[PDB]
Amino acid sequence: APAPAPAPEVQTKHFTLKSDVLFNFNKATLKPEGQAALDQLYSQLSNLDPKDGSVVVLGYTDRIGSDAYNQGLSERRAQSVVDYLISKGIPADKISARGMGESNPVTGNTCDNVKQRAALIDCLAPDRRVEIEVKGIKDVVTQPQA
Structure with missing residues (x-):
């Protein structure tokens, strides 16, 4: 947990990982294509710089009418x-x-015209996604518009 006096700008790289790829209806168990993608992403994060050696994994869950339950799933996943x-x-x-x-419910927007239970649980899917926050990672110069 170093913090002497950072002079250069930190290289924060947030990765949007879809729960569907990992786990959709399952508790949090990783599926084949899940582990596979997690491996490729891992390397991209493994070749990072220890300077910041900071990798915070964030989990976004949906609303099931039980805040405590949602949090339990967020931590589990x-x-x-x-x-x-x-x-x-x-x-x-x-x-x-x-x-x-749920630090930022997107559904509360994309699902605005949705006030039905089943309709919500179904429209409350866009809230299942983990965001891997890796800083201190270096990469080659990116070319405008791939």
Whole structure:
């Protein structure tokens, strides 16, 4: 947890990981294509710089009418992701598993015209996504419009 006096701009790289790829109806267990993608992303995060050695994993869950329940799932999934991300050869101390639960409900917008239970639970899917926050990572110069 160094913090002497950072002069250069930190290289924060947020990765949008879809819960559908990992787990949709399942608790948080990772599925094949789930572990596979997690591996490729892992490397991109493994070749990072230790300077900041800060990798916070965020988890976004949907609304089930039980805040406590949503938080429990947010931490579980966030943990399952990290738990698997560790076996990739990364210190469990350099990372962090956080349950983002619902820090910004997008559905409350894309699902505005939705006031029905089933309609909500169905429209409340766009709230299932983990955001891997890796800083201190370096990369080659990006070319405008791939």
